[PDB]
DNA sequence: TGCTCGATACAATAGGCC
DNA sequence: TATTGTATCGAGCA
DNA sequence: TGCTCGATACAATAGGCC
DNA sequence: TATTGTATCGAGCA
C-alpha cells in the first residue's frame, strides 16, 4: 500500500553515493520540499548530445527537472566518472565510454527539454567548502523553482499525481485514454503493453506484436543498444532510431520486410529498472519508417509522442 | 572559515549506515530542525548498565537527547550489533562483548539522565515498512521535544550556543572560568588541557601532570580501558574509576604513593575522535581517592562535575 | 621468466615484522644453511592449540610437518599481543590471548597433531642474558640435520614431491595426480579452482557449495570454520570433528531434515586468509561424513577420509 | 661474557632495513661465511669523494672490504636515500645533504683504500638477467674474495683477531704498544683514551689533554662536523682537518695559540656508536700543524697513522 | 494430457579493484 | 562485475 | 647527552563497491 | 578508498 512508497523513497535515498555532497543536498531538497505527490529519481542516467552517458543527482520526471551537485573533479567516490563541460542544459558529470558499454541495458533517458539546476558546494575549489548558509540558499531557491513548476503544470491541468499502485497497471492508461511520452510511462512486462492495445495475454515472448486495431502499426520491444543479434541505436533527441543486424546478410534480407511491412511502430524499449535490476519497458513514442539503407540499415523517425490505447476485444 | 561546520555536518551524516532506515530518519530530523546552534553526533557510542557497549543514531550533547531508529531484528547484514532489551532510557541495540573489547579506545559516554526517543519504522514486523506519514509524525514530535528542551535551557540561561572555532581552543575555557560535563568538553591533545590550568606547555608526552595552582590535585590523562602497562575501568554512570596495573609489584609500590597523595585528580580520558580517528581528551570530572588494594586496587570516586580554570603561570 | 615468484616469496617470508628479538637470526640462518628450496617453508605460522587459543610457530616446513620455535622466556618482546605459557611438548610456548584470538579467526590456522616441534633456547639463564653463538649454531645444525633426515625418509618412500610455485595452486596439477591429499598440504586460490578439480568447467563460483558431479553422495563445501553473522562453525584442534550451526534457530529447524536425508559426505575446503597479502584461499581439510544432528549443538561432521579423487572436466 | 658477541651480531643484522634485498643478501653472506673471528658492520656510514654522506650494507673493518646490494631507484624503505654513480670503489647509495646534516654526529669513515663488492640483484655487466641462483653465485664469489683477503693478511701476519671484551679496554692497548688505524680503534670515553697515554683519570670532561710523555703533542677530542661553538671538517681521504670557529674574534685570538702552541695533535674524534648512538671516540691519527689564516682557518695534515701508547705514571 | 527440456528472468555473491 | 543456480512458462515430443 | 613516549607521517591492509 | 599498523621526530626531564 503506502509501504511501497516508503520503501521506494528509502531506496532512492540509500544508493551508494557518487559524490561527497550528494547525499546531503538531495536529502535536504526532498525533506524540505516535503511533497510526495512528486515522483523523484536519484542517479538518473541520461544521454548527452555527444552520445556519452551521463547522470544527474536528483530527477523529477513529472516536471522534467534535474538537480546536480557540482564538486568539481577532486572528491569522487567513483573514480569511474569524469568532469567536463557540455551543453547548458546538460550535466557536468559523465561516465567513461568503457563502462558506458556495460551500462547499455540501464534506463537512459533524453534531457533535451529538461532543465538542470546546479548546487555549488565549493568556494574557490580546490579545498575549502562553502558555508552552509549559501548551500541552503541555493537549495531553497531550487525548491521554490520546483514548486512553481508543479503549480504551473496543475494550472495547465497537465499534472497527474503519482500513485505507486496504479502506475504500472495497464487499466489506468486504458482509462486515461492515451499512453504519453510526457507521463513517463514504463510497464513491467511485454504482456502488459500488449494488453493496453487490446490483447489479452497470460504472458508474451516475442520481440514484436501486431497492433490489433491498426494493420499498418506494429508494437515493438527492441533493445535500443547493441546486442548479439541486433545493432540498434537511438539519438539523444529521441527522434531517430536506427535498426541494423550484426550479420549484414540478415540486414539485406530485412530490407524487403521493412519496406513492404507495417510503416509505423509503437516503441517500448527494454530497460533495466533503476532499482531492482529488472526488465521494464518504457514508451519511446510512435515512429514511422523512413528509409532502409544497406549500410546504415533501417531508420525510423518519431511522428508522435502519444498513442491512443484500447480495451481488449 | 565556516567550512569546518560544513565538513563536520557532511561527515556526521555521511557515516556508513548501521541500520537501514537510519540515514532517512536522522537526515530528516536534522534538516527539518535545521538549528545549528545545536551540536549533534551520529552513531554515538554509549555505555549501558551492564558493561555492554551500545550506540545511538543521533545525539544532542547540549540537551542530553538521543534518537534511536527501531527496526530491531534485521539489522541489515552484516552488522556486529545485536537487538536486546535494557533499561527504559537505554538503547535497544548493542554490540557483542567480543567486539566491545575491540572498541575500548572509542569515545564512550554515560547516558545517565539522558532521554532516548525512538522511531518505529515497521507497522507489521517482521517485514512490512510503515507509511511515511506516520514516520514523519514521529519525527515531528521529536523535533518539538528538541525545540522545547532547547527553550527550557535558554530561558534558564544555561544554554551555550555551539561554535566550531572556539570549542577546541583552551583560551575560551580559561575565559569561561570553568570546565563542566554539561559543556561536554573534549580537547585535541594533552598540551591544551594542560594549558587550561596555567601551563605554557609546547608538548606533553607524560601521563600525569602536576597541577600548578593546587598541590592536592593532579591532572590525569588515563586510558580508562585495559592496555599494555595497566588496567583501568569506569562505572557506566561515570561515578567510580578503578586503577590497577599488569604487574602486581608496581601496584604494590604505587599503593603507598596513592595513599600519601595527591588525594584528588581532575580527569581527562583519552578517547578516539568520533570523526577522523585521532586521539582526543575528554573531561570526565573531578575525582577523589577512596581506597588502596590489590586487584581493583586504587578507586577514585567523582566528587565534582565542574573544575575552575587558570591563566598561564610565569 | 616467473622464477621471480620464488624470490618474492622467500624475501616476504623472511621479511615479516618480527615477533621476537632473536627470531630473524635463527630462521634466516636455518634457511640459508639448509639451502634446499625444494622445501617450502612458512614463517609465523598460526597453529590450533588443544586449549583452543591460537598459537604461532616461527618456522614451518609443511612437506615435512616440522616446526621450529625460538625460546626466549617471557619478557623479551615489547608491545605485542603474544603471551608466554606452558602446554603440550609438541605445542608452542607462545600464544595469543583469547580476546585477540577471536579477532584473528579468519587467518589460516592449522592442526599440529602429528607435527614435531624443535626449540632453540637462546638464553643461558633468565634476565635476558644471551647464550654464546656456539651452542646456538649447534642447535641450528642438529635441527637442519634432522630436517634433511626427514626429507630423505620421505624421498625413499616416494612420498616427497618437490615444491613449485607455478604448479601448486593450479587445479590441473591435482587432476593429473590425480588425488588431493592432506599430506600435500593443498590450498587453492578460489572456489572455482576447487570445483574444477572435481569435474566442473566453472568460470567463477560465488555459491557456498556445489554437488560432486561424479559422486551423488558427496558435496563440495567451502565453510568458514569460525563464527560469522550467518553461521556458527567450529573445527576440532585435531581436525577430526567439524560442527555446524546457524545463528538463528528458525534457520536451524529448516536445516535438520535437509541434512539427515541430504548428501552424507562432504569434501571440505575451508576459507582462510592468505598468510601473505590477505586474500581468500581454500584449504583442503578432508572428506567428512555426517555423524550427527543434535539441534542445540547443530550438525556433527566427523572425518573419515584424508584423501579425495579429482576428475577431468565433464 | 661471550654473550656480547651474540647480542652484537643480532643487533647488526636486526636494523631497520633500507633496501628490499638487504636482509637476505647480508644474512646469507654472514651465515654462509660463518667466520665470527671477523668483525662486521651493517649500514656503515662513509664519506664519498665529494662531501656527500653515503652508506654501505655490510662492512669488514679488518679487511677494509665493503659489500653493497644494487636494487636501483625504487624499492626504497627510506625516501631520503638517493641513487647515483660515483668513484671506482664507492657506494651507489647516498643521503640527501640536509638529511645528512642531522647525521653529522654519526661515525663516518674514509673508504679510500677500501674495496667494494656489489651484489647485482637484477642484472650484471655483460648484461645477463638473474634471480635466485645467480644472486647466490655472486654471494659465493664474494665470500671467497673475503676469505682470500683474510688469508692474504694472515700470511703477512698483519691480521689481528676480533675480541669484543678487550677491544674497548685501554689495558690491551697499553699492552700491545701501538694504537693504529689498521686496528680500527674506538673507545667508550675520554678518560679511557687518556688513560692509554699514562693518565690515571677517573673522569675527564675537557676538549683536550696535554700529553704526559711528550710536551709537543696534544691529545684532542674534536667534533669533526660543525656545531654551535666550532666549524670543523675532515677530508674524505682523512688526510686534512680544518678548524675554524663560529665567531671570527675567537678564530683570530686562537691563531697565535695555534702558531705558538704544541704543533702536533693526537686526534680521537667524537662519533656516535652505530648501535645505541652513545658518544664514542674513534682514532683518526697523529696530525701535525701545517698552516693557519683567518679566511679559511687552521689546517692540520696527518703525519702518521700509528701512535705509541704508555703505562700510567 | 503428462513428461523432458530449453530459454528467459531473477536473486545471490566471491573475486578483484579502488 | 561477471557468473551460476533456482524457479517459471512455454515449446517440443511421446 | 641519554632516555621516554605522544603526536605525527606513511606504508600495509581492511572495507566498500561493481 | 578508508582505517590500522609501524617507524620516525622531537619536547620535556633527569
TrEMBL record, chains A, D:
Show the InterPro entries listed in the entry.
Answer: PvuRts1I-like_N, PvuRts1I-like_SRA
Q: Where is the Restriction endonuclease PvuRts1 I-like N-terminal domain?
A: 7-147
User: Domain PvuRts1 I-like SET and RING associated, which positions?
Assistant: 172-309
Pfam families on file: PvuRts1I-like_N (PF21598), SRA (PF18491)
> What's the protein name?
Uncharacterized protein
Q: What is the lineage of its organism?
A: Bacteria, Pseudomonadati, Pseudomonadota, Gammaproteobacteria, Moraxellales
Automatic annotation (TrEMBL), chain B:
Record's InterPro entries? PvuRts1I-like_N, PvuRts1I-like_SRA
**Name of the protein this chain belongs to:** Uncharacterized protein
In this chain the Restriction endonuclease PvuRts1 I-like N-terminal domain maps to: 7-147
* All copies of domain PvuRts1 I-like SET and RING associated, residue ranges: 172-309
Amino acid at each position: 500500500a503506502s509501504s511501497d512508497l516508503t520503501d521506494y523513497v528509502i531506496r532512492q535515498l540509500g544508493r551508494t553515493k557518487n559524490k561527497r555532497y550528494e547525499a546531503y543536498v538531495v536529502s535536504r531538497i526532498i525533506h524540505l520540499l516535503n511533497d510526495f505527490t512528486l515522483k523523484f529519481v536519484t542517479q538518473q542516467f541520461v544521454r548527452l548530445s555527444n552520445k556519452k552517458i551521463a547522470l544527474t543527482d536528483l530527477y523529477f520526471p513529472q516536471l522534467g527537472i534535474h538537480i546536480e551537485v557540482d564538486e568539481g573533479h577532486h572528491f569522487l567516490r567513483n573514480s569511474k566518472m569524469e568532469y567536463s563541460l557540455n551543453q547548458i542544459d546538460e550535466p557536468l558529470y559523465s561516465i567513461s565510454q568503457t563502462e558506458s558499454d556495460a551500462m547499455r541495458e540501464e534506463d537512459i533517458i533524453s534531457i533535451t527539454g529538461h532543465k538542470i539546476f546546479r548546487v555549488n558546494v565549493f568556494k574557490n575549489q580546490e579545498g575549502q567548502p562553502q558555508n552552509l548558509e549559501n548551500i541552503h540558499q541555493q537549495i531553497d531557491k531550487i525548491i521554490e523553482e520546483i514548486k512553481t513548476a508543479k503549480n504551473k503544470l496543475i494550472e495547465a491541468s497537465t499534472f497527474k499525481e503519482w500513485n505507486i499502485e496504479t502506475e504500472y497497471n495497464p487499466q489506468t492508461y486504458i482509462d486515461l485514454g492515451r499512453i504519453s511520452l510526457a507521463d513517463n510511462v514504463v510497464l513491467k512486462t511485454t504482456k502488459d503493453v500488449c494488453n493496453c492495445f487490446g490483447y489479452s495475454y497470460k504472458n508474451y515472448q516475442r520481440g514484436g506484436a501486431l497492433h490489433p486495431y491498426k494493420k499498418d502499426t506494429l508494437i515493438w520491444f527492441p533493445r535500443l543498444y547493441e546486442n548479439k543479434d541486433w545493432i540498434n541505436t537511438i539519438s539523444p533527441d529521441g527522434l531517430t532510431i536506427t535498426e541494423k543486424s550484426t550479420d549484414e546478410t540478415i540486414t539485406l534480407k530485412k530490407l524487403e520486410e521493412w519496406k513492404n511491412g507495417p510503416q509505423k511502430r509503437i516503441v517500448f524499449a527494454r530497460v533495466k529498472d533503476n532499482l531492482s535490476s529488472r526488465a521494464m519497458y518504457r514508451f519511446m513514442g510512435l515512429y514511422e519508417f523512413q528509409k532502409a539503407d544497406l549500410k546504415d540499415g533501417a531508420v525510423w523517425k518519431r511522428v508522435k509522442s502519444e498513442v491512443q490505447t484500447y480495451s481488449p476485444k
